[PDB]
Amino acid sequence: QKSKPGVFSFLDPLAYEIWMCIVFAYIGVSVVLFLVSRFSPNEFGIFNSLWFSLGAFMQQGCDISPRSLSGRIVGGVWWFFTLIIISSYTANLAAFLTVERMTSALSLSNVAGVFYILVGGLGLAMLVALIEFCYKSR
């Protein structure tokens, strides 16, 4: 029968190996961008490069962009990667929702996982802010 959707059912469209490769590709792109910016110019520190890569993956307009050819090559290749990956995710999710193998409105049980992840992220961010605040005085 129609199986109960899991907490992390939103990871179904892409294989877990693909997710792991995406995480390592994100880390590698950030490291390469940081090295290129530092050795061949700093606006692009390690944390700022991580933020740039994360914002590029989520298709959100970042506040800083590379201003050299060597960094812009990384930026363009990363944008192409993220566009292809997001298109593949959307297409695979649509294929999953069209043909059912063992259509009504999407239930909240299918996307409860991202709500749990969002709440956990907000709690972790509040904890980090508190830690930084108490450390700043000392």
Add this chain to the structure above:
Amino acid sequence: QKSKPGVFSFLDPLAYEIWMCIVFAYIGVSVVLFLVSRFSPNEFGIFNSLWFSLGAFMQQGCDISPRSLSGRIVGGVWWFFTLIIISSYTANLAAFLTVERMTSALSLSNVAGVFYILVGGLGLAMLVALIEFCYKSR
């Protein structure tokens, strides 16, 4: 049989009534934003508001954003409209391509009209630039 793709076959997903309503909605949003910005303050002129609305519809980051609640309501409602319209367009195009009623790789003949429109826009832009250049001296 499979009919010959038209020049404007990319308008198939949405009815022409929806396209006309989108054009008038764009014009109206630009006019309302200009009126609100001028009467309740200018960075948002008529041309800049038209550019802002066009950039918002194409989901491209613009250089100017409303800085008052009255214009920000317009911006948010316009963003919601564009998001819903683009999602509907993509879904309808996917439905058209999946089920054939009277799958192989998309041929260039399906999107040839987009290239023709792009070239026409480039030519018109060059003509406008030339006109502005010769008028500026006089």
Add this chain to the structure above:
Amino acid sequence: QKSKPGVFSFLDPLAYEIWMCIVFAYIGVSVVLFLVSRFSPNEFGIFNSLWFSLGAFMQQGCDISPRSLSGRIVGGVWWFFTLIIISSYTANLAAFLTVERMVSALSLSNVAGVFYILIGGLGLAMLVALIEFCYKSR
């Protein structure tokens, strides 16, 4: 048999529980981002954080990105949530249209709710602009 889509039929792809939880998540993320950017170091007030969250959810970018670590964690989790939600909406709307056509462009009646929402938003924006005009002068 005959049928005609009703107003606000574009809310079908996501259950109303999902929409309500999206509204609550929006308000919560905006308030938490304001909190972590006020007691600890910016431009992220309550209203500006609400605007940033609204822009991030609509995939329309933002004029200002968070700088603090907690603010960036909030931004990242919000971007992930909105990416998943938009992908799910597009995929399930495509599934709805494909199943409907399997048993034909979208008509104006399917997005009449979106156009009505746009008109109401413009009217409310003009009204609040008038109210601000009266209030600010005094």
Add this chain to the structure above:
Amino acid sequence: QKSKPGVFSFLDPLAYEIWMCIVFAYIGVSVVLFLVSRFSPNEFGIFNSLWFSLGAFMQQGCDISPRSLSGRIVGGVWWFFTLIIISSYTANLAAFLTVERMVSALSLSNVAGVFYILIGGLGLAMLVALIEFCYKSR
């Protein structure tokens, strides 16, 4: 029956003619934007126009937006082109996956070409950074 997706299988949704014409359209739009932004008044050099066109096609935003009327016409037609192209790509990939499933997540082999492209781009960018370091030192 047995099969395995090949490398660069992600180019299947669009014919290679479409990809070639996309590359030519990118380069042409970049050069036309540079031409109309060099004589009408900016920051739109040939390299910056290439970066702007690449950012607009990837729907990832940009740090700089056109000011003149001709530049904004070029930007608008380019945005329309890239919106149509991305919508067509996503819709046809969804159609491909739906038809494949109608006759389960995407494996790493389906997007292995993208990862290979990313690795090659990072290596090329590091090489270009080294070359730029050597040239700028002298």
Add this chain to the structure above:
Amino acid sequence: SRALTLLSSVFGACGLLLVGIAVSTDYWLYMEEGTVVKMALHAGLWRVCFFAGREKGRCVASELVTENTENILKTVRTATPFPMVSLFLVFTAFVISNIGHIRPQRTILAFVSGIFFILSGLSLVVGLVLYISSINDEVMNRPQYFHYRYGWSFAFAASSFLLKEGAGVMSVYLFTKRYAE
């Protein structure tokens, strides 16, 4: 600044009342089953009452029904703790904020009141999401017509979340103004 304090305390009081009533009442969801009404009942958070069917008029504590609805009754108990947690958090925020207003000399109370209000709002959101997810996941497995509809206690909780978050924002601004003063 006095007006901001008054509105912050008012919003805290309304949130506390709206969650206390929501927890104390038993109209979270009405569910009915019958063959095309065998029975029709309303269930709260701890007790269920039947207003139709063979056993009409009898209120049963969470322990005559198909297995699916009884599994739903079980699954509500899993999401039970979060409304209590949010009620405790908002009560602590209310008392700490009132103690802050009654003692203007001590200014740190407003910040902790805002933090507690915001945490209570997040906890309430988590509880509502978990409750709805459990209900939907249970009905999706159902194997005769089955109709369920949310009640006014759920609307009370939904409005109380917004009231808590407004009170938290007002408390943060009150703390900022107090430090500036």
Add this chain to the structure above:
Amino acid sequence: SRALTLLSSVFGACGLLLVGIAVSTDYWLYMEEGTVVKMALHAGLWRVCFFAGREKGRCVASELVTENTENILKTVRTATPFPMVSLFLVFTAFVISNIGHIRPQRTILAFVSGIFFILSGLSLVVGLVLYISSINDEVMNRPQYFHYRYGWSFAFAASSFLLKEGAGVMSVYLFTKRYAE
């Protein structure tokens, strides 16, 4: 500035040669049909030659073949004008740029050379897009195996577009430097 002038003139010469050869040659596409080879031929822009089949060795001018391929032969004639237009534009750009280099005192020649080169590139892109669109739209209606493959003249045109646009950018920069000097 002399190096930029030499590079711009070189790129203009290469673009002119790459379009003249592409127009003058007859290897735009090879198409073959047979039953599972009845015939196999290569077709250019104005003349077609058969290198297999019953009539092998005979070159026929655009006027023994199924109706679909003959409709393809017709549809190429619709896209014929654009390569000629682009060739004329690039030839005018080449001569005007050479006249500009031979007379450094007159500086406006580089700008018009760049404009002509860029217009020629856009016209070539339009011609290639129209040609491919006509071919694809014609084969999509086909009712036996049919295989078609592009030739080296098409690659010459594709490379000549890039050469033209590079020459145009170089000419624009040359004119800017000349005005600055």
